[PDB]
């Protein structure tokens, strides 16, 4: 119908933006129309938002400042719009330093109508923003590394040495029980120094534990300083599993002092690399009562010496040291198995601007992915969480993994507002919720439900106001993955009662029959008024229509439904196919917008978003003709055998286009059918040329006229019917130039018969 597919505008392929969604915007003050597009993070462009305009017969894009900047992976970008301004949300990851968890929620920016920053919102630690009484206005009427330096000198007899091995094993087992990030290395020293196993081997706890029992005694002189040096050189390095940011610990286990060590203790301890290593000295045996060995122990250990230095009567007493060492070495990990709650709520997953201050944001991951929505006041910086009432615990568990808040929308009634939400996983076939308010308590309840499992009913919502009176009349709910043969999709059109606000199914829409994979209903949008009848017109996308067929040059479609007084059309008025737009388009029809004049004609236009590109379609003027005819004589006298004069004048009855433009380059083509319906006609054209396929150029005014003559048919006229009214049918048609034309050529109104009948 009305959309001009012969003249598309496309963002350059492999261009700076890899479009994920396209969106039209207009500043109500300056009347400037932009094309906002989104993109994932890439080395070329940090994203996430660009504003694009039509420069040199092409779409050129520049980024929008004061928008949040994602880092690393693409978690998700969400953008919405209203006459109040533009809302941006980015899913962000914050790794809390203390514990082994993650928080995944949104950071948002609310720009004004002209894209100037107004407010910002970070949603980490949400319990400090919340307000369980905020009024819901509706117009009411780096880990830890430990290196053990085991003394193997012969003074330890084999029994004591098995006891020492058991101490190391119990230390490892105990530490792993309460420190998940801990890692271990073992260096056995003496006459020679010997890595039993470095930090890398400790990633397999069972094997490392096994290696401990496998040790063999070196049994020679005590070279402790060399053991420390070797731990410094070989254990604590990036080449053997050590990490720079991680804490570094030592546990020395000796039964005597140094004697005949080639290295020097004081230089080893003072070495540049030692700075930052927490040395613990464990002393065993009677020798340590002597002052010199006590000095050596106090020298190896780090102060406070009472908590790092140690002494034990015999090798049996080691089993008791575990408590003190565990307290003094490993910091408490804290709670890790706590419930989720708002930690992964993913706020900003969907969005909606309610007015200048208030936004409605989706919270799919709210409570074990139960979902919900946050009603946020961007000025006071306080919000209320709305969700399904938990009731008993048996019911709360049943609501898990519904994904409520996957999609959010607002319905406009004659006197009040109403918030609706999407739960595509509800009971495994989907549902749509609605906020029921009863004094203090406001909560979501199911109103509509899907029928097929896995169809993702409620994943897309589109309230439609047909006559633009400020009151929603229909609600479009998509189930894009509906399955008959493959995933074809389905769309449910729901009528809204003017009395109670209830819902009642009116129609079920499906894509073109012939495609098993279409994903029809994945994207829908109310595109303002395109046909120029002052009724809203909807668009739907089938991004998989034609996928994998032939060379796969292009796939995806867009259906255009026109609105009527009785509701949405039964069948689409247009079907734009990716292959007829341009080569290379993949997933044409997964984002859409319309209703703003971007070409300069003053007529509302369209934008369709490919998975990687954006397309802008110019709308065409819709022309309605008015046919008038005059006769001379006004009626044929009985027995008349002369020639009848006819004056046929067409007129542009539509104010869509200026009179001086006429029909531009389109030629008016009309034919005359004289005395239609009679087996043998009583009149006929004076010249067959003059009345068949008559092509004419418009006068450049608001009217066009022609003169024609008709003559009686040859031979005697049948007596069966001699005085019945003669029917003349003037069928007209517009012949438009082929190709890419500067102005959008007119298109005849599809919903008006392209002909008229007059009688003589």
């Amino acid at each position, epitope marked *: 119908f009305n959309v001009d597919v012969a003249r598309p505008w496309l963002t350059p392929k492999g261009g700076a933006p890899f479009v994920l969604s396209s969106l039209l915007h207009q500043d109500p003050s300056t009347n400037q129309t932009w094309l906002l597009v989104t993109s994932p993070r890439t080395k070329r462009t940090p994203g996430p938002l660009h504003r694009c305009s*039509l*420069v*040199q*017969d092409e779409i050129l894009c520049h980024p929008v400042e004061h928008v949040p900047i994602p880092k690393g992976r693409h978690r998700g970008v969400t953008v919405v719009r209203s006459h109040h301004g533009v809302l941006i949300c980015i899913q962000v990851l914050v790794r809390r330093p203390h514990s082994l968890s993650s928080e995944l929620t949104g950071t948002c920016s609310l720009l004004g109508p002209d894209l100037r920053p107004q407010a910002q919102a970070n949603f980490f630690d949400l319990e400090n923003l919340l307000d369980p009484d905020a009024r819901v206005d509706t117009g009411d009427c780096a880990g830890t590394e430990i290196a053990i330096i085991l003394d193997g000198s012969g003074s330890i007899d084999p029994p004591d040495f098995q006891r020492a091995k058991d101490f190391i094993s119990n230390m490892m087992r105990n530490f792993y029980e309460k420190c998940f990030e801990c890692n271990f290395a073992l260096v056995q020293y003496g006459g020679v120094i010997q890595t039993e196993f470095d930090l890398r081997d400790s990633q397999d706890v069972m094997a490392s534990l096994a290696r401990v029992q496998n040790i063999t005694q070196v049994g020679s002189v005590t070279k402790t300083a060399s053991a420390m040096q070797h731990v410094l050189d070989s254990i604590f390095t990036s080449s053997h599993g050590s990490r720079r940011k991680a804490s570094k610990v030592m546990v020395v286990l000796t039964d005597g002092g140094i004697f005949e060590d080639p290295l020097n203790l004081t230089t080893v301890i003072n070495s540049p690399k030692m700075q930052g290593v927490e040395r613990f000295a464990i002393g065993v045996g009677e020798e340590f009562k002597s002052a010199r060995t006590a000095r050596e122990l106090n020298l190896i250990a780090s102060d406070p010496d009472e908590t790092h230095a140690f002494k034990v009567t015999n090798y049996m007493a080691l089993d008791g040291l575990l408590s003190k060492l565990r307290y003094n070495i490993i910091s408490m990990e804290g709670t890790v198995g706590d419930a989720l709650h708002y930690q992964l709520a993913q706020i900003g997953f969907s969005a909606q601007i309610l007015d200048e201050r208030q936004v409605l944001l989706g919270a799919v991951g709210a409570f074990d992915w139960s979902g919900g929505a946050l009603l946020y006041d961007t000025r006071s910086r306080r919000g209320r969480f709305l969700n399904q009432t938990a009731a008993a615990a048996a019911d709360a568990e049943a609501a898990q993994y519904s994904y409520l808040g996957y999609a959010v929308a607002v319905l406009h009634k004659t006197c009040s507002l109403s918030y609706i939400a999407g739960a595509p996983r509800y009971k495994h076939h989907g549902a749509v919720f609605e906020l029921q308010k009863e004094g203090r308590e406001a909560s979501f309840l199911p109103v509509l439900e899907g029928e097929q499992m896995g169809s993702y009913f409620g994943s897309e919502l589109c309230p439609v106001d047909i006559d633009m009176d400020g009151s929603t009349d229909f609600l479009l709910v998509a189930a894009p993955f509906y399955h008959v043969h493959g995933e074809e999709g389905r769309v449910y059109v729901y009528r809204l009662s003017e009395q109670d606000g209830s819902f009642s199914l009116a129609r079920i829409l499906s894509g073109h029959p012939g495609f098993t994979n279409a994903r029809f209903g994945f994207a829908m949008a109310a595109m303002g008024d395109l046909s120029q009848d002052k009724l809203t017109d909807v668009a739907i996308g089938a991004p998989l229509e034609g996928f994998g067929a032939d060379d796969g040059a292009s796939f995806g479609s867009v259906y255009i439904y026109n609105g009527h007084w009785d509701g949405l059309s039964a069948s689409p008025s247009q079907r734009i196919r990716a292959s007829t737009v341009a080569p290379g388009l993949q997933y044409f029809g997964m984002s859409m917008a319309g209703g703003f004049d*971007i*070409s*300069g*004609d*003053g007529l509302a236009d369209i934008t369709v978003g490919t998975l990687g590109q954006a397309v802008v379609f110019r709308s065409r003027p819709v022309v309605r003709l008015k046919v008038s005819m005059a006769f001379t004589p006004s009626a044929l006298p009985i027995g008349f055998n002369g020639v009848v004069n006819v004056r046929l004048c067409f007129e542009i009855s539509s104010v869509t286009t*200026a009179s*001086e*433009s*006429g*029909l*531009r*380059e*389109a*030629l008016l083509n009309f034919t005359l059918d004289v005395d239609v319906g009679k087996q043998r006609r009583r009149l006929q054209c004076s010249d067959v040329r003059s009345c068949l396929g008559c*092509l004419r*150029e*418009w006068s*450049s005014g608001s009217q066009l006229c022609e003169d024609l003559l008709l003559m009686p048919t040859e031979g005697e006229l049948c007596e069966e019917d001699c005085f019945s009214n003669a029917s003349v049918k003037v069928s007209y048609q517009l*012949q*438009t*130039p*082929e*190709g890419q034309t*500067d102005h959008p050529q007119p298109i005849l109104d599809r919903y008006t018969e392209p002909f008229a009948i007059f009688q003589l």
Partner: antibody
Framework: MVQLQRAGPTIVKPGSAVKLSCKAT????????IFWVRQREGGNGQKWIG?????????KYNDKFKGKATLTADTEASSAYMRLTSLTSEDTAVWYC?????????????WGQGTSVTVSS | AAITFNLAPESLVVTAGSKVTFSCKAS????????????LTWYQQRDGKPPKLLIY????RLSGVPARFTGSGGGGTEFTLTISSVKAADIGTYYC?????????FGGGTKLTVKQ
């Protein structure tokens, strides 16, 4: 009726830039296109330059003048402009703004009076 | 790329009251398949004056142009502007012009001269 006026002749040294003008009257300035053509002496005839749509600011250029000319419009003053960058002794010619016929297709239905540019040191 | 024109003869020697006929030919078809019109335009220029529009489509005259001018020139690749009876006011240069595709190009022109 429709008529177009221009600034007039201009003498500029080599290497400079000139911003011609083409005022428009008698019609809606934001509904029709404005085309520019370069007529040169010595049998060079005429060669099309580009277009501009004042209602939207959108432009299109012949590849030969892709980096040379730069058209713009002023909706309030109803006056268009061409900007020639790094003029050379070869750019000497007479230039014409135009207005496409409302019906049918005729790129230059109306012309301005004429403006002559000479690039001499 | 661009459509090329060959407007010959470069000039015509004519006498008042004698039929005249120009001719230019295009390297590509000008018959827009839909409207069936040929997108060629004819211009007239008097020395020291801006050009003027004579015939927009291959055979359609502009308002104000005297009837003695005729477009003719069908085919889609060969066109011929004909004057039934040349006159003094008709002495000038005529250019035919591409109108179907970009870049838009002219044919160089043909100048009329009175015979002596």
């Amino acid at each position: 009726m429709v008529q177009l006026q221009r600034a007039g002749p201009t003498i500029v040294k080599p290497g400079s830039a000139v911003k011609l003008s083409c005022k428009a009257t008698g019609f809606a300035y934001e509904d029709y296109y404005i085309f520019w053509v370069r007529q040169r002496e010595g049998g060079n005839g005429q060669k099309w330059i580009g277009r501009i749509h004042p209602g939207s600011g959108e432009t299109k250029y012949n590849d030969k003048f892709k980096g040379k000319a730069t058209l713009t419009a002023d909706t309030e003053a109803s006056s268009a402009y061409m900007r020639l960058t790094s003029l050379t002794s070869e750019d000497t010619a007479v230039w014409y703004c135009g207005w496409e016929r409302s019906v049918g297709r005729a790129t230059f239905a109306y012309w301005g009076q004429g403006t002559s540019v000479t690039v001499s040191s | 790329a661009a459509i090329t024109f060959n407007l010959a003869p470069e000039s015509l020697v004519v006498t008042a009251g004698s039929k005249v006929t120009f001719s230019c030919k295009a390297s590509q078809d000008f018959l827009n398949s839909a409207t069936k019109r040929n997108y060629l335009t004819w211009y007239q220029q008097r020395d020291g004056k801006p050009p003027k529009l004579l015939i927009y489509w291959a055979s359609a005259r502009l308002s104000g142009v005297p009837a003695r001018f005729t477009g003719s020139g069908g085919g889609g690749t060969e066109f011929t502007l004909t004057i039934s009876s040349v006159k003094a006011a008709d002495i000038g240069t005529y250019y035919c012009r591409q109108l179907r595709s970009r870049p838009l190009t002219f044919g160089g022109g043909t100048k009329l001269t009175v015979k002596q």
